[PDB]
Design an enzyme around this catalytic site. Structure first.
Site, PDB file in Angstrom:
ATOM      1  N   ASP A  22      17.908 -18.006  17.920  1.00 26.66           N
ATOM      2  CA  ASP A  22      18.223 -17.210  16.733  1.00 26.66           C
ATOM      3  C   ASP A  22      17.693 -15.755  16.910  1.00 26.66           C
ATOM      4  O   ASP A  22      17.870 -15.156  17.994  1.00 26.66           O
ATOM      5  CB  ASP A  22      17.707 -17.888  15.447  1.00 26.66           C
ATOM      6  N   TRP A  23      17.053 -15.192  15.872  1.00 21.84           N
ATOM      7  CA  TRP A  23      16.559 -13.825  15.935  1.00 21.84           C
ATOM      8  C   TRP A  23      15.548 -13.641  17.056  1.00 21.84           C
ATOM      9  O   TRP A  23      15.405 -12.539  17.610  1.00 21.84           O
ATOM     10  CB  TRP A  23      15.992 -13.405  14.577  1.00 21.84           C
TER      11      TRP A  23
ATOM     12  N   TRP B  50      24.656 -20.243   5.136  1.00 27.89           N
ATOM     13  CA  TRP B  50      23.266 -19.926   5.516  1.00 27.89           C
ATOM     14  C   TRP B  50      22.802 -18.645   4.817  1.00 27.89           C
ATOM     15  O   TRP B  50      21.765 -18.629   4.124  1.00 27.89           O
ATOM     16  CB  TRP B  50      23.233 -19.785   7.038  1.00 27.89           C
TER      17      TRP B  50
ATOM     18  N   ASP C 148      24.916 -27.319  15.467  1.00 26.18           N
ATOM     19  CA  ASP C 148      24.741 -26.014  14.844  1.00 26.18           C
ATOM     20  C   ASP C 148      26.108 -25.439  14.466  1.00 26.18           C
ATOM     21  O   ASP C 148      26.980 -25.280  15.324  1.00 26.18           O
ATOM     22  CB  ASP C 148      24.032 -25.062  15.811  1.00 26.18           C
TER      23      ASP C 148
ATOM     24  N   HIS D  45      20.791 -26.041  14.433  1.00 31.41           N
ATOM     25  CA  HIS D  45      20.430 -24.667  14.735  1.00 31.41           C
ATOM     26  C   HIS D  45      18.998 -24.613  15.252  1.00 31.41           C
ATOM     27  O   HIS D  45      18.699 -23.867  16.184  1.00 31.41           O
ATOM     28  CB  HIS D  45      20.534 -23.831  13.466  1.00 31.41           C
TER      29      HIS D  45
END
Length: 310
Positions: free
Chosen positions: A124-125, A175, A260, A289
């Site tokens: 992710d980030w 999300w 995900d 995810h």
């Protein structure tokens, strides 16, 4: 100083399976008055360092199943909490969070701790940001473990890294809606929805950093930055693609959380092709995810892959 608040330490009193001692860096260059928390586990003089970067809306708690595996291999493990998250200080204004605010924090941390022989571990980030680090100082990085992540380039250069923003409706669209809309955002309930295998105690650990909405500015801003990417983010992310494609010659391991709806196969296979030498992905059928929640497998298999071609 940026205007920021600090989560009371009692919020972390009863965490489930997080026996890792806190370390703090205050007044990193460019972040005066802000205290950042990081885990520093395993042999401090290890040759290898696993730098584990979390994403939205989590913290180093997400890596709790992976850290012991890496540390027992004899490596050092550094797992920082981004400002706005975990035990790090939390700027109160969403405007203070930007792509480069977070990116420059990571670069400052790496320089401050003088991390070398880094195995970059991202999701992710943690990936959107982390994947842009090695080109800034390539000799410090040795390996990559990549889980559900990509690069925040523009839609034309990589459509795969933008299409997920608008379809499917129950993916990033849902999300983001869940994170930016509620006035009373309950991250325990969020995390149980998006990682349905969490126990109640695990879910509570994700709410722990956030006594109330005033502490959640960073949480609100992350998804907005996925949908609206500033020019700096676009340029840096596009440059990163060239790095992984043309310059990277390190060891790489990929794992995909196949359930995900955000950053699954339709994002991760395009990402695989862009990373020079990236092998066939480990597909984790049951993982969504938050791949790290099935992270013992990822850590163990990555270590075997890496031992195979030391």
């Amino acid at each position: 100083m940026i205007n920021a608040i600090r989560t009371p330490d009692q919020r972390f009193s009863n965490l489930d399976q997080y026996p890792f001692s806190p370390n703090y860096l205050d007044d990193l260059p460019g972040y005066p008055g802000l205290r950042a928390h990081y885990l520093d586990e395993g042999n401090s003089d290890a040759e290898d360092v696993f730098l584990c970067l979390h994403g939205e809306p989590t913290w180093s708690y997400l890596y709790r199943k992976m850290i012991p595996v890496f540390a027992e291999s004899g490596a050092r493990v550094i797992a920082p909490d981004f400002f706005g998250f975990g035990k790090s200080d939390k700027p109160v204004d969403e405007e203070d969070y930007t792509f480069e605010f977070h990116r420059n924090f990571l670069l400052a941390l790496i320089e401050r701790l003088d991390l070398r022989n880094i195995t970059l571990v991202v999701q992710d980030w943690g990936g959107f940001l982390g994947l842009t680090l090695p080109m800034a100082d390539p000799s410090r990085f040795k390996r990559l473990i990549i889980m559900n992540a990509c690069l925040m380039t523009d839609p034309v250069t990589q459509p795969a890294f933008s299409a997920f923003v608008t379809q499917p409706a129950d993916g990033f669209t849902a999300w983001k809606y869940d994170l930016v809309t509620p006035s009373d955002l309950r991250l325990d309930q969020f995390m149980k929805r998006w990682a349905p295998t969490l126990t109640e105690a695990e879910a509570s650990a994700y709410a722990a950093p956030f006594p109330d909405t005033s502490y959640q500015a960073g949480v609100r801003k992350f998804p907005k930055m996925v949908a609206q990417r500033d020019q700096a983010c676009i340029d840096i992310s596009t440059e990163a693609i060239s790095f992984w494609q043309n310059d990277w010659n390190g060891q790489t391991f990929m794992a995909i959380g196949m359930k995900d709806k955000l950053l699954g196969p339709d994002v991760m296979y395009p990402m695989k092709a862009l990373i020079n030498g990236c092998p066939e992905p480990l597909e984790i059928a049951d993982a969504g995810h938050f791949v790290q929640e099935f992270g013992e497998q990822v850590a163990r298999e990555a270590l075997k892959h890496f031992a195979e071609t030391e």
